[PDB]
Design a protein around this ligand. Sequence first.
Ligand code: YHI
Ligand code: YHI
Lengths: 306, 306
Amino acid sequence: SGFRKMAFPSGKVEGCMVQVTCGTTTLNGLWLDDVVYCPRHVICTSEDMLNPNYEDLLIRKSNHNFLVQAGNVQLRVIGHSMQNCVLKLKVDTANPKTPKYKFVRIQPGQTFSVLACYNGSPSGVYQCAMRPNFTIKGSFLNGSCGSVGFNIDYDCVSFCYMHHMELPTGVHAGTDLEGNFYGPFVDRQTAQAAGTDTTITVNVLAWLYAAVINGDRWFLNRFTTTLNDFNLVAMKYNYEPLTQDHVDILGPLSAQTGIAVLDMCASLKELLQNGMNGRTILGSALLEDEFTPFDVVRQCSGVTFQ
Amino acid sequence: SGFRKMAFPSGKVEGCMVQVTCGTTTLNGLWLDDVVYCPRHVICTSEDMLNPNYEDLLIRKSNHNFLVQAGNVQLRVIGHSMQNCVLKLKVDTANPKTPKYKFVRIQPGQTFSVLACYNGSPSGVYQCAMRPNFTIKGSFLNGSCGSVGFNIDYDCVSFCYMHHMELPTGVHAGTDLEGNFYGPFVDRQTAQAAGTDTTITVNVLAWLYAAVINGDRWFLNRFTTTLNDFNLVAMKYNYEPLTQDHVDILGPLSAQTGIAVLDMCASLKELLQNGMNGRTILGSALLEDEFTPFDVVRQCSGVTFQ
Ligand SMILES: *[C@H](O)[C@H](C[C@@H]1CCNC1=O)NC(=O)[C@@H]1[C@@H]2[C@H](CN1C(=O)OCc1ccccc1)C2(C)C
Ligand SMILES: *[C@H](O)[C@H](C[C@@H]1CCNC1=O)NC(=O)[C@@H]1[C@@H]2[C@H](CN1C(=O)OCc1ccccc1)C2(C)C
């Protein structure tokens, strides 16, 4: 037993991380087969970075301007192109450590592992959720751009995120691996700001089920509620509405605990209206919303990846 | 910016994980050079497990009783010996992925990354602290024994933990890689229980400094306190005493924020006596004690590992 915010093993991604330097900018790239993917703002200079025209900037570039280093070994760039907000640098060597991978775009409410990197060297790994406002609450310093987020499904790495920037509230914004931003953000220095967030209701319920599975039961009650009456209380506390599909997705966790989804909703209602009154749930004094029903089932069952 | 519970990249450890099966017991082993390390209770059967004599049990074993699988490849066991509570299985192949490593034993209050594994396959990675009572609050199911905890220092993996068992409160106990248990526990089914824990005071202060670095300042005050007067309040709330060495270790974080250690202690005092009053610190409604001053400096600066 036990319940921890758990990332996927990072090894398959570590073998893809490289350093990309152009002019005075150094950041990370993702090396898959013979292509290195990196944020296109690597072509910028600090006076380019306020209102750049990236096509203009890229046509003035040469292959040899891009210094790509995989560990202590230089990769020769033999072609370059822009795809939305990422650059694809064609190099003369296919990465022999390329895992089976996909490029997927995730939904708000979904989680993934981030491999924080600097100078092409992995620094740390942690779990993030895509917020309803398309930001992520990460940990990113200068030089971390090009770090990727991912999930692993058996032996296959589904890359879903590349880091590009920090917003003024200290949250983070980036793209999918096709270079399309999550949310209404641009790789421009503007006055852009995150925008109002909400709490991921289905995830809170999944985490409550994780708590029950692990022996935290004090918040359970005999009450119940209708989906409609629960959703009235949801909005009120700035929680996302709960759909019948969410109820369906929680079925397995309901069947394992013997607690009907709607009964767990009644528990959540009381927690929202009363607080926790000095008590904790899975070591937290807050209702946690960054675990999906999948994350709970995986960890409270023990799936692996080879 | 941002602050997240961050594990080390797990790749170097993933390459060492194997499956060890003996009789009806399957667990994980750690394969370094030509030795596989695993918990000695792999030699047990469910009727052995109440009060076993492990030397007796081991002399009745044969090399061929131990099935070791590294991925889909069987490793021939050519020797075996017991070292305290771990088994060393000598195999006919040195692990070509053996990283530079050390076997270190950590102190309570210190943190490390756990690579949860099942059937020799890594499942997830997360950060744990050694509690003052020598348990860890992990996430471990049946089959997870032999998963290891570690830190990485440049390119060197310092293994500090091997998982053996869960205690009745749902916390976890294990050994260093020399097979010596952390804390007063035995790999026997008895009525053993964790024992009273305390909060790691120096770590709470480090996390407060992490908060300030990231723009949470509401808990700061103009008051100060003496080390002695702070430690009176510490005990009271079941916090560990703060030593002058702890104050010294917090010096760099004090110098970066401009907040004297003793002033941050005065802030902690008020948080202990008043609570947080609906507010959060780094997304937590509790005072977090599983980040060391090192962890804060690493993440709020950006060290990597190659
Ligand atoms: C790429 O390594 C960097 C990552 C930032 C740096 C601080 N935290 C991060 O996540 N990305 C950027 O610097 C982007 C880039 C330039 C502005 N920018 C950005 O994040 O601005 C906000 C910021 C910068 C530095 C420190 C705090 C906040 C453009 C092209 C958007
Ligand atoms: C090894 O894979 C297993 C890991 C346990 C299983 C549940 N959570 C864990 O961390 N270790 C054991 O089963 C050890 C082993 C036998 C008893 N034991 C143990 O942990 O007992 C408590 C327990 C067991 C199963 C489920 C919940 C709690 C001995 C030799 C100590």
